[PDB]
mmCIF file of all heavy atoms in Angstrom:
data_model
loop_
_atom_site.group_PDB
_atom_site.id
_atom_site.type_symbol
_atom_site.label_atom_id
_atom_site.label_comp_id
_atom_site.label_asym_id
_atom_site.label_seq_id
_atom_site.Cartn_x
_atom_site.Cartn_y
_atom_site.Cartn_z
ATOM 1 N N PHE D 217 122.555 97.279 128.182
ATOM 2 C CA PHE D 217 122.272 97.240 126.755
ATOM 3 C C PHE D 217 122.751 98.538 126.118
ATOM 4 O O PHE D 217 122.861 99.564 126.792
ATOM 5 C CB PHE D 217 120.778 96.994 126.482
ATOM 6 C CG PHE D 217 119.847 97.793 127.353
ATOM 7 C CD1 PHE D 217 119.343 99.012 126.929
ATOM 8 C CD2 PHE D 217 119.452 97.305 128.589
ATOM 9 C CE1 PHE D 217 118.475 99.737 127.731
ATOM 10 C CE2 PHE D 217 118.590 98.025 129.393
ATOM 11 C CZ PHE D 217 118.100 99.243 128.963
ATOM 12 N N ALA D 218 123.063 98.473 124.828
ATOM 13 C CA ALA D 218 123.596 99.607 124.087
ATOM 14 C C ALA D 218 122.601 100.072 123.028
ATOM 15 O O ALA D 218 121.589 99.422 122.755
ATOM 16 C CB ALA D 218 124.933 99.244 123.439
ATOM 17 N N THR D 219 122.904 101.218 122.429
ATOM 18 C CA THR D 219 121.988 101.833 121.468
ATOM 19 C C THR D 219 122.715 102.954 120.728
ATOM 20 O O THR D 219 123.897 103.212 120.958
ATOM 21 C CB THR D 219 120.720 102.330 122.174
ATOM 22 O OG1 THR D 219 119.625 102.360 121.249
ATOM 23 C CG2 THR D 219 120.926 103.703 122.800
ATOM 24 N N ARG D 220 122.002 103.595 119.803
ATOM 25 C CA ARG D 220 122.518 104.740 119.059
ATOM 26 C C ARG D 220 122.208 106.025 119.818
ATOM 27 O O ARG D 220 121.289 106.061 120.639
ATOM 28 C CB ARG D 220 121.890 104.798 117.663
ATOM 29 C CG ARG D 220 122.466 103.812 116.647
ATOM 30 C CD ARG D 220 122.094 104.204 115.215
ATOM 31 N NE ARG D 220 122.625 103.290 114.209
ATOM 32 C CZ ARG D 220 122.225 103.259 112.945
ATOM 33 N NH1 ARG D 220 121.280 104.072 112.498
ATOM 34 N NH2 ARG D 220 122.780 102.388 112.107
ATOM 35 N N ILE D 221 122.954 107.093 119.518
ATOM 36 C CA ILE D 221 122.723 108.360 120.214
ATOM 37 C C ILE D 221 121.291 108.836 120.012
ATOM 38 O O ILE D 221 120.621 109.247 120.967
ATOM 39 C CB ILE D 221 123.729 109.435 119.758
ATOM 40 C CG1 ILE D 221 125.162 108.904 119.830
ATOM 41 C CG2 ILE D 221 123.554 110.709 120.589
ATOM 42 C CD1 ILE D 221 126.235 109.998 119.851
ATOM 43 N N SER D 222 120.790 108.773 118.778
ATOM 44 C CA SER D 222 119.521 109.422 118.477
ATOM 45 C C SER D 222 118.391 108.896 119.348
ATOM 46 O O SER D 222 117.364 109.571 119.485
ATOM 47 C CB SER D 222 119.169 109.233 117.001
ATOM 48 O OG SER D 222 119.199 107.863 116.639
ATOM 49 N N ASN D 223 118.552 107.715 119.939
ATOM 50 C CA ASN D 223 117.549 107.153 120.828
ATOM 51 C C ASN D 223 117.780 107.505 122.291
ATOM 52 O O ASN D 223 116.968 107.120 123.136
ATOM 53 C CB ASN D 223 117.508 105.630 120.671
ATOM 54 C CG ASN D 223 116.781 105.194 119.416
ATOM 55 O OD1 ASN D 223 115.929 105.915 118.899
ATOM 56 N ND2 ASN D 223 117.104 104.002 118.925
ATOM 57 N N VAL D 224 118.850 108.238 122.614
ATOM 58 C CA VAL D 224 119.210 108.512 124.003
ATOM 59 C C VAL D 224 118.787 109.924 124.380
ATOM 60 O O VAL D 224 119.289 110.912 123.830
ATOM 61 C CB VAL D 224 120.720 108.316 124.229
ATOM 62 C CG1 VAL D 224 121.030 108.324 125.718
ATOM 63 C CG2 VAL D 224 121.184 107.023 123.599
ATOM 64 N N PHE D 225 117.871 110.017 125.343
ATOM 65 C CA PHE D 225 117.430 111.293 125.900
ATOM 66 C C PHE D 225 117.797 111.310 127.376
ATOM 67 O O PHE D 225 117.424 110.396 128.117
ATOM 68 C CB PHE D 225 115.924 111.496 125.734
ATOM 69 C CG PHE D 225 115.416 112.747 126.392
ATOM 70 C CD1 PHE D 225 116.042 113.956 126.156
ATOM 71 C CD2 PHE D 225 114.348 112.709 127.274
ATOM 72 C CE1 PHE D 225 115.599 115.112 126.756
ATOM 73 C CE2 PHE D 225 113.902 113.867 127.890
ATOM 74 C CZ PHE D 225 114.527 115.072 127.626
ATOM 75 N N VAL D 226 118.524 112.340 127.807
ATOM 76 C CA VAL D 226 118.819 112.497 129.227
ATOM 77 C C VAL D 226 117.569 112.975 129.951
ATOM 78 O O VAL D 226 116.894 113.911 129.504
ATOM 79 C CB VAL D 226 119.987 113.470 129.436
ATOM 80 C CG1 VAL D 226 120.368 113.513 130.906
ATOM 81 C CG2 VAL D 226 121.171 113.068 128.577
ATOM 82 N N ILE D 227 117.250 112.332 131.073
ATOM 83 C CA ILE D 227 116.117 112.730 131.897
ATOM 84 C C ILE D 227 116.551 113.075 133.320
ATOM 85 O O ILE D 227 115.740 113.036 134.241
ATOM 86 C CB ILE D 227 115.019 111.648 131.904
ATOM 87 C CG1 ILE D 227 115.559 110.317 132.440
ATOM 88 C CG2 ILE D 227 114.428 111.483 130.512
ATOM 89 C CD1 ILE D 227 114.467 109.336 132.840
ATOM 90 N N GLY D 228 117.822 113.415 133.517
ATOM 91 C CA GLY D 228 118.267 113.833 134.830
ATOM 92 C C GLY D 228 119.760 113.749 135.055
ATOM 93 O O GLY D 228 120.541 113.561 134.116
#
Side-chain angles (χ1 to χ4, degrees):
Chain D
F217 44 94
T219 206
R220 282 197 180 166
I221 309 199
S222 54
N223 283 335
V224 192
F225 175 50
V226 186
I227 59 164

